[PDB]
Amino acid sequence: QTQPRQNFHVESEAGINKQINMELYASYVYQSMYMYFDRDDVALPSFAKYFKHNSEEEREHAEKLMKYQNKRGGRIVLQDIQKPDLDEWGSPLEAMQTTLALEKSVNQALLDLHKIADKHGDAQMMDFLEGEYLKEQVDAIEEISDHITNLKRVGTGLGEYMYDKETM
Amino acid sequence: AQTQPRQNFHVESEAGINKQINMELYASYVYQSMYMYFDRDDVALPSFAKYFKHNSEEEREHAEKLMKYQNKRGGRIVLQDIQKPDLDEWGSPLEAMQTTLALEKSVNQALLDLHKIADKHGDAQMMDFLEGEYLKEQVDAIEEISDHITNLKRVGTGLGEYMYDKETM
Amino acid sequence: AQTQPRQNFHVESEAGINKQINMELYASYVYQSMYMYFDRDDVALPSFAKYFKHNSEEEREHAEKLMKYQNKRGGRIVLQDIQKPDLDEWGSPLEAMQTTLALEKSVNQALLDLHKIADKHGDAQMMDFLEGEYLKEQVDAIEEISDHITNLKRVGTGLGEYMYDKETM
Amino acid sequence: QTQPRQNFHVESEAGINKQINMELYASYVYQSMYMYFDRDDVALPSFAKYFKHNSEEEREHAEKLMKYQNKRGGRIVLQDIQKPDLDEWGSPLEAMQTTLALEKSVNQALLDLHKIADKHGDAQMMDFLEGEYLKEQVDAIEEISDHITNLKRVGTGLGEYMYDKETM
Ligand SMILES: [Cu+2]
Ligand SMILES: [Cu+2]
Ligand SMILES: [Cu+2]
Ligand SMILES: [Cu+2]
Ligand SMILES: [Cu+2]
Ligand SMILES: [Cu+2]
Ligand SMILES: [Cu+2]
Ligand SMILES: [Cu+2]
Ligand code: NA
Ligand code: NA
Ligand code: NA
Ligand code: NA
Ligand code: NA
Ligand code: NA
Ligand code: NA
Ligand code: NA
Ligand code: NA
Ligand code: NA
Ligand code: NA
Ligand code: NA
Ligand code: NA
Ligand code: NA
Ligand code: NA
Ligand code: NA
Ligand code: NA
Ligand code: NA
Ligand code: NA
Ligand code: NA
Ligand code: NA
Ligand code: NA
Ligand code: NA
Ligand code: NA
Ligand code: NA
Ligand code: NA
Ligand code: NA
Ligand code: NA
Ligand code: NA
Ligand code: NA
Ligand code: NA
Ligand code: NA
Ligand code: NA
Ligand code: NA
C-alpha cells in the first residue's frame, strides 16, 4: 500500500482516473470550439474567448482530480484523449446546445463517481466531489441554459453579433 | 386608554394604514415573483430580474415606513396574510410591465383613498407625510413604468427585448 | 418536457423546496412583526428591534437563495400565501426569544426533512447545498438564541432588560 | 399693506405671534429643567444636556416663526415670557411626563394655527407648518414617549443613573 492510503478503494481510484480522462476530453472539445469561433468565416471573438476559458478550466478540473488521486495515494493512469466528434460546430446556438449535452454527461459521470465513493464509505471523497465538482457543474449547466435561451431570443444574424459583444 | 403619543389620530386612519401596509407587502411579493420569473433559465433576462428585485425591496421598505409611522402616531400594527400573486408566470417583458403599471396605479389609488381619510379627520401631519413620502414617488414610478412600456413596444420582441435588458434595465 | 437544466432533480425535492420557501418567508414575517413590536412606544427597546429587523431580512434572503436554487436546478417556483404570525404582540424580551427559539427549531426540523428527501432520491448536490448553506447557519442561530435566553433569565426584568439591549443587542 | 403681503390674513399673523410666545415659553421650561438636573442634589448631567438642547431648539423654533412672520409681511409683537409653573421637576420620570404634556399642548396649538391658515386659504403657510413644525412635533412626542417607557422599565436609583449614562 502507498503511504497515504486510508479508506480509499481501488474502484474509487479507477473512477478518478476515468473522470480525469473525461475532463481532458471536455477541455479538448472546448479548445476545438474556441478555434472554430476564431475562424475567419465565423469570427465571433467573444464566443471564442468563452470556450478558451472553458477549455482552461476543464483542464484545471482534470489537474485537481490528478492532485486528489496523489493525495489519497492513488496512481494516475492516463489514456488517449479522444478527438472531438466534429471539426466544426455550426451556429453559436448549436455550439451551446452541444455544450449543454457535454456538461450534463460530465455531471452524470461525476454523480456516478460520487456513488462509488458512497458505497465504499469514502466520506472525504464524497465531500470533495460535492464541494469541488458537483456545485460547479450545477452552476455551469444553469449558465449554458441561459445562453441557449438568449440565443433563441436574439436569433441569427445581428443578434448573434450583439450577444457576442454584450453578454459574451 | 389611549397610547402615549396619540393626538389627532383617528381609528379610521389607523385602520387605513394597516390596510395600506398589507397592500405594500403584497406588491413586494408580486415583484419578488417577477424577479424570480425573469431569473428562470427559459426566460433569462438578468436586468429585468434585478429591476423587479429592487422594486420588491422598495415596496417592502415602503411597508416598513408605514409600520414605523403607525407606531410614531400611537397606532397599533395589525398584520394580515400576504396573498400570493395572481399568476405564477408573467409572460413577456412587455406584459410584465403592463401588469406592473396596473399594480402601481392600484396602490396609488389606495394611497389617495388613505389621504382622503386623513383629510376628513383633519389630520394635517398625516396628509403631508403621505404626500411627501408616498404620493410623490408613486407619480414618479408610474411615469417610469409608462416609459418602459413605450420603449418595449418600440423595440419589439426578440433582439429588442435583449437590447433593452442590456441598455436601459 | 423537462426544463433545460434538470438532471438528478426529483419532483418531490422541487415540491419540498417550494414548501421551505414559504416557511422562510413566514419566519421573516414573524421577525418583522417582532421588530415592529419592540419599536412600539410602550415597549421601546431599539436594539431588540434592530436584532429582529436583521433576522427578518436574513430569513427573506434565505428564502431568495432557495428560490434561486430552484431555478438553478430547473425547478419551478410556486408561491403560496404568507400566513400572518400567531400573535400581534410578543410579551417580554425573554418571551420573544423563547418564541424565536421554537421557530428556529421548527425551521431546522423542516430543513432536515428536506435533506431527507434529497438523500432518498440520491441528490448529492442538493444535500451538500442544504448542509453548507442552511443547516450550518441554523445550528449557529439556535445556539445564539439559547445564549440570549440564558442571559435574559440571568439579568431579569426591568433594568436588566434595558442593559441587555444596550450591551449585547 | 406691507410690501410682501399677499394671501396673508391678520388672523394668521396674530396666530403666529401667539405661537412665537408659546415656543419661547417652552424654551424657558426646558431651560429650567436643564438647570434643575444640574443641581448638586440632582446631578444627572446627561438629562441636563438633553433639556439644554431642547431649550435651544424651542428657541430656534420661535425664531423661525419670527422669520416667517417677516417673510410674509406680518409684524412681530412680543409678549412676556411666563415663568414655568414649577421651580423643580421631581424625578427624571416626572420631568419627562411633564415634557410630554408640554409638547402635546404645543402640538395642539400648531394644529390650531394650521386650521387658521386652512380656513383663509393660505396654502403656503399650511405647508410651512406641516414640513417645519408638525413633522418635528410628531417625532418629538414619539421620542419622549420612548423615554417615559424606558424610565418606568429601569426604575429609580441605579436605573436612573444608567439611563443618564447610556441613552441620554
Ligand atoms: Cu469539469
Ligand atoms: Cu453526505
Ligand atoms: Cu457534505
Ligand atoms: Cu409603494
Ligand atoms: Cu432561515
Ligand atoms: Cu417647538
Ligand atoms: Cu394640504
Ligand atoms: Cu403639503
Ligand atoms: Na469494485
Ligand atoms: Na465502478
Ligand atoms: Na476550427
Ligand atoms: Na478570435
Ligand atoms: Na499514465
Ligand atoms: Na434547445
Ligand atoms: Na451518491
Ligand atoms: Na450559474
Ligand atoms: Na449565461
Ligand atoms: Na433571454
Ligand atoms: Na370612520
Ligand atoms: Na375607511
Ligand atoms: Na419563477
Ligand atoms: Na408563484
Ligand atoms: Na407568483
Ligand atoms: Na399598453
Ligand atoms: Na385600489
Ligand atoms: Na415522492
Ligand atoms: Na415529501
Ligand atoms: Na407592533
Ligand atoms: Na400583527
Ligand atoms: Na403579528
Ligand atoms: Na426557556
Ligand atoms: Na417543523
Ligand atoms: Na378672523
Ligand atoms: Na384665531
Ligand atoms: Na434649578
Ligand atoms: Na450638569
Ligand atoms: Na414686540
Ligand atoms: Na406615564
Ligand atoms: Na388643519
Ligand atoms: Na422619533
Ligand atoms: Na427616546
Ligand atoms: Na424600554
Author numbering:
A (entry chain B), D (entry chain B): 3 to 170
B (entry chain A), C (entry chain A): 2 to 170
What does the paper say about this structure?
Ferritin represents a ubiquitous class of nanocage-like proteins that are primarily involved in maintaining iron homeostasis. Accordingly, ferritin plays a central role in taking up iron (as Fe2+) and storing it in a stable and unreactive form (as Fe3+-oxide/hydroxide). The crystal structure revealed that TgFer presented a typically 4–3–2 symmetry in a cage-like, spherical shell composed of 24 identical subunits, featuring highly conserved organization in both the ferroxidase center and the 3-fold channel. Each of TgFer subunits is characterized by a four-α-helix bundle containing two antiparallel helix pairs (A, B and C, D) and a fifth short E-helix that forms an angle of approx. 60° with respect to the four-helical bundle.
In TgFer + Cu, the ferroxidase binding site appeared to be occupied by one Cu2+ ion (90% occupancy) because no peaks corresponding to an Fe2+ ion were identified at this site, based on an anomalous difference Fourier map. By contrast, we also observed that merely one copper ion (Cu-1) was present at site A of the ferroxidase site in TgFer + Cu and TgFer + CuFe. In the TgFer + Cu structure, two Cu2+ ions are found in the 3-fold channel. The Cu2+ ion (Cu-2) is located practically outside the channel bridged with three water molecules, and the intermetallic distance Cu-2–Cu-3 in the sites is 3.74 ± 0.23 Å. The other Cu2+ ion (Cu-3) is located deep inside the channel, coordinated with the OD1 from Asp129 residue (distance of 2.71 ± 0.22 Å) and the OE2 from Glu132 residue (distance of 2.64 ± 0.36 Å) from the 3-fold symmetrical subunits. The occupancies for Cu-2 and Cu-3 in these sites have been estimated to 80 and 90%. The metal ions at these sites were confirmed as being Cu2+ ions by an anomalous difference electron density map. Cu2+ ions have been demonstrated to display special coordination properties, such as the ability of Cu2+ ion to coordinate strongly with the imidazole nitrogens, and Cu2+ ion has been characterized as an inhibitor of the catalyzed reactions between Fe2+ ion and dioxygen in ferritin. Thus, these results lead us to propose that copper binding to the ferroxidase site can potentially block iron binding to inhibit the ferroxidase activity in TgFer. Thus, it can be concluded that Cu2+ ion binding at 3-fold channel may affect the function of iron uptake in the structure of TgFer. On the one side, since the crystals of TgFer + Cu suffered severe cracking after long exposure times to the salt, we set the soaking time to 5 min.
